[PDB]
Ligand binder design. Structure first.
Ligand SMILES: C[C@@H]1O[C@]2(O[C@@H]3[C@@H](O)[C@H](O)O[C@H](CO)[C@H]3O[C@@]3(O[C@H]4[C@H](O2)[C@@H](O)[C@@H](O)O[C@@H]4CO)O[C@H](CO)[C@H](O)[C@H](O)[C@H]3O)[C@@H](O)[C@H](O)[C@@H]1O
Ligand SMILES: [Zn+2]
Ligand SMILES: [Zn+2]
Ligand SMILES: [Zn+2]
Ligand SMILES: [Zn+2]
Ligand SMILES: [Zn+2]
Length: 428
């Protein structure tokens, strides 16, 4: 049990005669680094060796490599709420849970985000951004085809048929071959793929209930030309954005900033709308986001300063303001000083980029509707491998996503059993 208390963390910042060097690895260097520099200016006794690890996929592989070698491990490492699990369960990350930290830091982060940085009773990071889903809609394309901004998956289907019949170079949306994109859709309609009871006890429901119904719907959308299967955040996707290939894009809301940065020519053409409802339920959402974690290898005499850094970067009021000023005036932060500020909720756009100026109100309503009835599996790295090998190849106009979900469940059951997890599946 970690004996680094909330007071010990604060002492690392006030005890300026105690110089520390911290190595910090991050994939989201573009959005984060100016605020890291602000930390260093404020606390010159804590020097930050900031390492941009490149693409997220390369970051996670690099970190696994150093952990297994037990050598050259960073003190602080960027994680995410749906990819940290396998690192936490394998002992790569410091579990810094204790009563003092829980009492103090729980007041600093919105409860949906604070729950998700726990796993198996341990506490593994400070939440960074929250990522409620938004539908980024090419309103110009919909207007041209006499189509309404869709509020439901039913509308996406019905209007999508009309769009693609009239203009076979455009699709209503993309079904993205990315584990976050795909699982976020299921979570946002209340369709559990699995349930976690303890670190060693899991239930897989990938071929039954609401999940199966939603898979059947996604497959019909692919077959009928409503959604196109393809990669996200690749050059193929980047070209499709500029080309207007997708009338809608339902995604984690950091993308709202990405469009402003990479697609200036789309100014005035998009609306930011709520993600869609399903079967006449009120709409729900999903939020994942990044987190900053401490490695299990971090030396004991560096741990208080490492924790002070992650808490400052992710919740200090000056840091939160820096996150806004250095990312086009908005970044959607989990800190309560952002989430509880009614002037963030009612913040108006002023750059003219989106056709609606109430973008943050849309993001905050979606955050309010996040489906919290959800856990990620202990082995999320293996989940992404199986998704890539088994599910992604069926994301096409003739695909059998239903059969692929059942085969992926079988592979995950075998992996769970081989690694000592108790597992049930809906095929048992
Ligand atoms: C790995 C990834 O981390 C989290 O998503 C990242 C966001 O938190 C961050 O703000 O923005 C990144 C993109 O610039 C996201 O990664 C992309 O990574 C996201 C992060 O997502 C965000 O927290 C934030 O840092 O922005 C980056 C993109 O600039 O996430 C997508 C999945 O949506 C995909 O993995 C890309 O390769 C990443 O670059 C989580 O929220 C994600 O679900 C995921 O775990
Ligand atoms: Zn707790
Ligand atoms: Zn058209
Ligand atoms: Zn077609
Ligand atoms: Zn390419
Ligand atoms: Zn401050």
């Amino acid at each position: 049990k970690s004996d680094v208390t909330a007071q010990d963390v604060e002492n690392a910042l006030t005890d300026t005669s105690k110089n520390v060097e911290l190595t910090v690895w991050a994939y989201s260097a573009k959005q984060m680094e100016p605020t890291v520099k602000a930390f260093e200016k404020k606390y010159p006794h804590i020097k930050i060796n900031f390492v941009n690890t490149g693409a997220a996929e390369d970051h996670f592989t690099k970190f696994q490599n150093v952990v297994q070698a037990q050598k050259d491990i960073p003190d602080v490492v960027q994680m995410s709420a749906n990819k940290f699990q396998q690192f936490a369960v394998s002992g790569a990350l410091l579990n810094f849970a204790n009563d003092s930290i829980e009492k103090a830091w729980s007041k600093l982060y919105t409860k949906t985000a604070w729950a998700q940085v726990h796993y198996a009773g341990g506490l593994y990071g400070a939440p960074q951004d929250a990522t409620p889903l938004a539908n980024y809609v090419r309103k110009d394309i919909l207007d041209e085809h006499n189509l309404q901004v869709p509020e439901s998956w039913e509308d996406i289907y019905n209007e999508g048929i009309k769009l693609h019949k009239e203009d076979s170079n455009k699709y209503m949306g993309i079904l993205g071959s990315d584990i976050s994109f795909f699982t976020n859709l299921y979570r946002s309609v209340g369709a559990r793929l699995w349930k976690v009871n303890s670190v060693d006890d899991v239930e897989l429901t990938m071929n039954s209930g609401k999940a199966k119904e939603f898979t059947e719907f996604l497959q019909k959308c692919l077959k009928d030309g409503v959604l196109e299967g393809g990669t996200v955040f690749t050059d193929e996707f980047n070209r499709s954005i500029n080309d207007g290939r997708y009338a809608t894009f339902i995604n984690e809301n950091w993308m709202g900033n990405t469009y402003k940065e990479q697609n200036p020519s789309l100014k005035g053409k998009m609306v930011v709308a709520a993600p869609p409802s399903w079967k006449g339920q009120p709409y729900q959402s999903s939020s994942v986001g990044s987190m900053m974690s401490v490695s299990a290898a971090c030396p004991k005499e560096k741990q208080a300063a490492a924790l002070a850094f992650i808490n400052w970067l992710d919740s200090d009021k000056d840091a939160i303001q820096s996150w806004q000023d250095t990312n086009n005036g908005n970044f959607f932060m989990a800190a309560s000083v952002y989430q509880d500020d009614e002037n963030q909720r009612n913040k108006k756009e002023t750059d003219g980029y989106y056709a609606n100026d109430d973008v943050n109100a849309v993001y905050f309503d979606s955050m309010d509707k996040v489906n919290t009835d959800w856990e990620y599996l202990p082995f999320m790295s293996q989940v992404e491998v199986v998704f890539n090998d088994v599910i992604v190849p069926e994301m096409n106009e003739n695909g059998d996503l239903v059969g692929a979900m059942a085969k992926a469940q079988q592979k995950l059951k075998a992996y769970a059993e081989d690694n000592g997890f108790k597992v049930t599946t809906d095929a048992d």
